[PDB]
């Protein structure tokens, strides 16, 4: 679920999902066009594609369980949708962590009109 993804993001990065990643660039929280602005935005692009791989799942509301094995996120077994949603979220959270070094506050609240063109997943 979105709240769980948010908790995962905070655990990984120390930033609150809202507002640090809810309106970032072209793809983080609400976005489907444009060239991703940087590596963090590409995390969201891929995450959006990942959710797109699950048309019959409900990633925003369906809850999954996960644990930590010495820092590492381990998605626990739920329904097939839950497992796949968790893997998408885990990847994005790790990606945000991997790219914290280039995160730029100038991409927060990024205006929609600066996001043009469809990029295939």
């Amino acid at each position: 679920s979105l709240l769980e993804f948010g908790k995962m993001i905070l655990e990984e990065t120390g930033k609150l999902a809202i507002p640090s990643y809810s309106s970032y660039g072209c793809y983080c929280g609400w976005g489907g066009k444009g060239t991703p602005k940087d590596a963090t935005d590409r995390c969201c692009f891929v995450h959006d594609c990942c959710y797109g791989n699950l048309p019959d799942c409900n990633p925003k509301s369906d809850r999954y369980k996960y644990k930590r094995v010495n820092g590492a996120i381990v998605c626990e077994k739920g329904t097939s949708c839950e497992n796949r949603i968790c893997e998408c979220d885990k990847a994005a959270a790790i990606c945000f962590r991997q790219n914290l070094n280039t995160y730029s506050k100038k991409y927060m609240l990024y205006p929609d009109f600066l996001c043009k063109g469809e990029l295939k997943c």
Binding site: L2, S22, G29, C44, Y51, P59, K60
Partner: peptide, 4 residues
């Protein structure tokens, strides 16, 4: 909830 905001999308993704």
């Amino acid at each position: 909830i905001a999308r993704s």
